[PDB]
A paper describes a structure:
We also reconstructed a 3D structure of the pentameric complex at pH 5.4 in the same way. The 3D map resolved a pentameric structure with clear three long α-helices per subunit in the cytoplasmic domain but poorer masses in the TM region except for a rod-like density inside the channel. Although the quality of this pentamer map, particularly the continuity of α-helices at the periplasm, is still not quite as good as those of the hexameric complex, a single rod-like density appears again inside the channel in the TM region. The [name] complex has been shown to be a cation-selective channel, but this pore size is too small for permeation of cations unless there are large fluctuations of the central helix. Thus, the structure of this pentameric complex suggests a low efficiency, blocked or semi-blocked, energy transducing state.
It utilizes PMF to take up diverse compounds such as iron-loaded siderophores, haem, and vitamin B12 through outer membrane receptors. [name] and [name] together form a proton channel, and isolated [name] complexes show ion conductivity and cation selectivity in vitro.
Author numbering:
A (entry chain C): 10 to 233
B (entry chain D): 19 to 233
C (entry chain E): 12 to 234
D (entry chain A): 11 to 234
E (entry chain B): 10 to 234
F (entry chain F): 19 to 40
The structure:
Amino acid sequence: LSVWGMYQHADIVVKCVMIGLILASVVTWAIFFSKSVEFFNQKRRLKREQQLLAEARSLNQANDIAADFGSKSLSLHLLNEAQNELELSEGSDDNEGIKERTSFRLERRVAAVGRQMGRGNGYLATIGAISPFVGLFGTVWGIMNSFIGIAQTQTTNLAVVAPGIAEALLATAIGLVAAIPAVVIYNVFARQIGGFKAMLGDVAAQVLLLQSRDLDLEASAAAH
Amino acid sequence: ADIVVKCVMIGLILASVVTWAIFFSKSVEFFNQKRRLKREQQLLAEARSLNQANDIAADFGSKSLSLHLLNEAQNELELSEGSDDNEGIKERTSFRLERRVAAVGRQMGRGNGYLATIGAISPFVGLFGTVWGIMNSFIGIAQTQTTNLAVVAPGIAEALLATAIGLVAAIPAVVIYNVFARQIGGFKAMLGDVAAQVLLLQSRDLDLEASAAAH
Amino acid sequence: VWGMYQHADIVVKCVMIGLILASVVTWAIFFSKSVEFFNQKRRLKREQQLLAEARSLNQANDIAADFGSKSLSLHLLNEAQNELELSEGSDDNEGIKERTSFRLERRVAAVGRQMGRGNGYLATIGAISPFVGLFGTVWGIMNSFIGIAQTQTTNLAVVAPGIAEALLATAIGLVAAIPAVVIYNVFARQIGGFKAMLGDVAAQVLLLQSRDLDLEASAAAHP
Amino acid sequence: SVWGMYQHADIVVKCVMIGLILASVVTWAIFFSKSVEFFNQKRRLKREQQLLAEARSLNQANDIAADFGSKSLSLHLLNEAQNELELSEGSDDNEGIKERTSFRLERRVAAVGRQMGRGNGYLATIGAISPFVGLFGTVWGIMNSFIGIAQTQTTNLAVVAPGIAEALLATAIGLVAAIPAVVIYNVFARQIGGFKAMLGDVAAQVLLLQSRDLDLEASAAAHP
Amino acid sequence: LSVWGMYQHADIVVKCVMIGLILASVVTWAIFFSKSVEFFNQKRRLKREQQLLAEARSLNQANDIAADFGSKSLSLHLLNEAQNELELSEGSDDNEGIKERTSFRLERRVAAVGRQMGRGNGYLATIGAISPFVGLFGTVWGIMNSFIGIAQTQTTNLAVVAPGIAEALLATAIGLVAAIPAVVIYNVFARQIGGFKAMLGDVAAQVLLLQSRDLDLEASAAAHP
Amino acid sequence: NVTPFIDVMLVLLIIFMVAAPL
């Protein structure tokens, strides 16, 4: 129909379906924007601080490199957690235990920060999965009113069904628009979760082994 | 109108009633648990001895899950009496937590797969409803030569009503399961934080035993 | 009609009865495992109340003695006494336990493999039964297209019995599909409950014999 | 005509359908061969497990698990055990060996899975996606049928009555390659999974035996 | 009508969708050819080199054999990681701690070596999954435009509007064309995952056992030096 | 996972629609 025609060519319940799908689309586009630019900042910071921290031959050197990151470095707070257990296991001659004790601490904390950013997963994944099924409801509603239009005519041609056909197809197409980029950029962001959080775990094992080698020095080399 | 398609639709609506009742109960309970856990997590973050762990968890009431885990810890404190093995206990006690906390999660493990798979296969039982309806329509026009699909148009519409309520029951059950499993992850994560803190408390205390006897 | 039961085809009727007879076989699977874990939850409930405070491995044996010969706890005590008889001469208490434990845990998977069978029937058949029904649809509508290319009016009741038997194929696929995956989700809750609680019992025995081997490794040490 | 029913639509659809049937036949050969092979293995390890649960010593295990035929996998497990026993020579550390040797067998157990892990993609994934192949062939046939409807416009009743039924039949041959093949690896999991138990039991047991045999050092041959 | 007469007549949105399907297919073919050629270079080369190194038997002859592999020896870089830990073993009198510090380091890099080729995979696999749904939206778009076009006046006669529905179904056709072999290629890349990661984990455990037996010599055979 | 091939039934509904004007 016309512009205001195709505004009115879909029924007001079908119109509510349309607006619900497009609004869920746009708010998760904003969620996409947030995740994309924030992970952008995080991976450029990852690149620069990875170059800054690969050279960390001492963990005290790593603290020095954690200093000139800004206060908002995740690795800075991981070294804060490291010094925390240096002060909590202050007095632990069991150098063999501590690090394991520390490790799984590590194997939550900024991973939980990563599990912060996995909060928006249900939006993209599940709304993109159910949006064609919302389109299925749009088909059910439109073809039910199409059957009403057949029962008003009993002509059984394309004319007596076709506006409800167009409304159901409009609901279907808007369900698919709300479907496909959501699930696919869900999979994009989960792959980003994988790569980024994995390299963060690489940095975590780097810090673990910095402390592990330094406490091996204090255990066996400072024995001697 | 029709009754068997209506039986399928009221099965959908009554499963929706069970689902919403479970959702309401879970969600109110989870708010209680999580805001209480927010405050009590701020409390027990600096529970710095096992005695301080009991004393800070003392005012929680008997509804503290973690107080029973302090009871778990004191239980294997008392059961490990007689032998000098500090060293085994802990892992075992960790695994006691690896039992108990999972049990806590399995405390709510019952209706989860129920409503998850209900939201999964609700379009499939709506599909069966429309299969039943359209098959009865073509039994109604199983003569030699018919025309005029208006004689079977409202029957197929009432068949599509089954798919409609199948979708209506399908959406929020899978939705609410994904929300609930998401904060299963969140709440079990915070509870594992608490469990790890208790393990580190008792681990540092047994290290101060093995080191205070050493130093 | 009785002719309408064998209407226009019998091999699609053959897959109808194939779906519902595989359903009956898995119904036998269902009610069997149902009364099985019913007996198990009642029994292990009672036996849980018993052996939760069996203070010794001797109490783990004697408090298990009233179970009858058909308890899994009896088999786990057999595993424990087996490692006792195999660690004769082993002054290393400290090893044994680890070597013992996963024995149990392989046995625990054998516990799952006590009923590892039957499950794939319910689960996978309840998944793909409407695809069997889908082939029934394609068969029926191809035969109806043979009919309406024989008539070439292609309207409207000339397609109707083929459409009806295609939907009958769909419907029997759906009847086979839904309760089968339902029953496997029920059986996965049985997996969770029985696995977890029997693992609680296994951890109980491991704690008991762990503390007893600690009392042997520190027998004349702590006094 | 019956050969008319063969020759209605097209020959590319014929090529797709016979490709489905030939992939079916080669995976039937896969199913048959792995079936008779794992029966040989099941009957074998059945009586072997009967005789080797009673293998009360590792030398009794070398006696019993030798033959059994010369082609026992357990013989190669005994070979790897004696290999690292000969590679245990010089090091009095009992405590290291077995740990490593554990996962040796477990990596060998991985090799055992990697014995038969290759080729399952054919069976399972072709059983999954064959109706999607037939779906595409049906899309092909119905689009050509719509070309035929465009050839005879203003009347679309019997312009394509049979030929669409051939394209759907393409889906049917996708359907005829759909059901059992997935099921096959389901088959080729389950008691094979028990095999992942069973053989993975006994050498582990032999490990346990060897562990207790190392106790026959570490608790018995410890003090000369 | 001719294919250009069916195609330029069709909706340009559906045309852009189908050409995006074919271009993502070209990306997939390039990535597949690259992983295939590189992986069999790895397979043949490091298979013969695996036959060499499984009985290198010295862990310095493991270095010497892996010295002349060419520059692309991943295994010699893992030997460089081992010598790095030996340089981190300086002062470490505890042989037993080192090993633990050694262990995961191999499977810190190796799956990263796996994630050397870990990129591009989820891309083309999920392309092969969801491309027919993209073509399904192409069908809904085209059939929606056609059945608005026969509903405005409103007309009848599907037979004179059916080529629009066929040009719509062409989107699902090209979506399936891209959909099948991309899932196929990730399944054979998962077989590559199995072969490469398992085999190089065998190499990793080989080096672990070499240097592990050497530290067992230094801790127990050199206990009686 | 393998759910949306109710769309095949939607294609069957398209066939039901082309059967209508006859």
